[PDB]
Amino acid sequence: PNAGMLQPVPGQAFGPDGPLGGISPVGFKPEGVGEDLKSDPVVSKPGLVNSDASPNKPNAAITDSAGTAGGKGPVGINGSHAALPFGLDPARTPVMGSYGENNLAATATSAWYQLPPRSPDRPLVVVSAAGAIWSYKEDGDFIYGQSLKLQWGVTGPDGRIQPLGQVFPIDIGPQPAWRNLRFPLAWAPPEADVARIVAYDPNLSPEQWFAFTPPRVPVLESLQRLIGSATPVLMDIATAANFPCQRPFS
Amino acid sequence: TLVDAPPAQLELGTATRSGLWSPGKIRIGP
């Protein structure tokens, strides 16, 4: 995921926390990520095939992905000792969050990041994030959290970027763990060649924060070209009739 | 007890209501 990474537009004014902060972050700092972001316990359904939970009692289990549950690692380019998921390089990925700030209202708008030209195989803008974030889910419903928006923008004939339009993220993953928030490039107007994040956390509860990371336009490739139907794989019980070319280990 | 605080005086009174009067709903959740 270090391919695109959206280098920002040159010739702007930053602070001492890099271009991800903007001009003056009120409550966002590089060392603002919690270090135990596991999950809420998932309760097991009573009768479920291929599950050895007991029928006499209600059961709850806590699982999460690999690398997306906190920890510490090498120092980045802001000075954040945070462990980044999905194989992101700390030497090239700034972080910025508001974790232990339960007295003020956090606020930060990043710099203008330069979008690549339109292409049919790069349809997405992705932002990795943790904590509690607000979004809708395909029904007009909502998930309760804080604000992160990624305004668009268009550059004129000279260096005068006109902003236009803010959008909510598409968010699917577990609540506090790291995940990718998605902004399809079909939401963008035909003239939108820059972007910028708009963060705002006014809630003072100790469990409301989001700790984002800069945007990127990923370079995707099929899973059949990645795995390749010749390497040993461990398909689970559910995901084994849908992948009939990948072979299990002998 | 956390704080040394004596109980309060309650300022009571009476009022004749009806069979359909209500002062509003009860705050049962956010």
């Binding site: 509860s205 | 605080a5 009476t14 209501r17 509003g24 709903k25």
Partner: protein
């Protein structure tokens, strides 16, 4: 035919008088609250059982804030500052060393830098909170353009949970300071006389209707102890003993 009009009128009366009792007046007892108390500016305790009042109103003049130490203090609270979840589900008027701010259940209703309220402009801090409104209205000072520094969140689910009027202050009562809550004593009523009369009338009418129906069922030629209720059996002895033993 004289005992057929009774079973009609006394049966309709006992219906129109009994389907009309849960609509008649009652006498509610209404409690209030108002700190100070003895004019001594100390904490009190009032653990509401409904966990929430009907209204709430605080005044908090400006001299009280002007005459505080350089440290923060809590000029007015609703739960003790060191409670379990006191910032949540309570209301605070904290005066911290950099700013004054009225808070609520984890939302900042209003906040103003302290060097502005410490000026001859501000006069008081009205913190009313009722159904559909939790505004904060710092009188005096003006929002940069034209507004008189009011707040919002008309959410009706923002009334603070009250267990007292705990404060960080000591001394005689300064003029202007006034809290006032209205306790939800809606279930503690007693019936009027116009409801007791209806209850008594309904019961008397439904007794007379049944008496007339009885007197009417006897136009057949009958009216006005068997051998079963007179015998005693080993089964009865066993059942009585097994009830009396299990009761103990």
């Amino acid at each position: 035919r004289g005992t057929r009009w009774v079973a009609t009128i006394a049966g309709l009366i006992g219906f129109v008088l009994s389907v009309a009792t849960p609509l008649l007046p009652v006498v509610q007892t209404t409690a209030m609250l108002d700190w100070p108390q003895r004019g001594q500016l100390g904490s009190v305790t009032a653990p509401l059982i409904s966990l929430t009042p009907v209204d709430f109103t605080a005044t908090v003049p400006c001299d009280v804030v002007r005459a505080m130490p350089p440290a923060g203090g809590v000029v007015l609270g609703t739960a003790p500052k060191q409670g379990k979840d006191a910032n949540l589900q309570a209301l605070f008027v904290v005066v911290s060393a950099q700013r004054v701010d009225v808070t609520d259940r984890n939302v900042v209703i209003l906040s103003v830098p302290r060097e502005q309220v410490t000026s001859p402009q501000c006069q008081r801090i009205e913190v009313t909170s009722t159904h559909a409104g939790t505004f904060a209205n710092f009188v005096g000072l003006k929002d940069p353009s034209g507004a008189p520094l009011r707040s919002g969140f008309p959410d009706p689910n923002l009334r603070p949970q009250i267990v007292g009027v705990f404060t960080d202050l000591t001394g005689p009562a300064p003029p202007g300071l006034a809290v006032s809550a209205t306790i939800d004593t809606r279930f503690s009523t007693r019936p009027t006389t116009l409801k007791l009369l209806a209850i008594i009338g309904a019961i008397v009418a439904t007794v007379v209707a049944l008496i007339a129906l009885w007197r009417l069922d006897q136009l057949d030629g009958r009216g006005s102890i068997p051998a079963s209720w007179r015998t005693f059996t080993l089964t009865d002895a066993v059942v009585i003993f097994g009830f009396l033993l299990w009761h103990v």
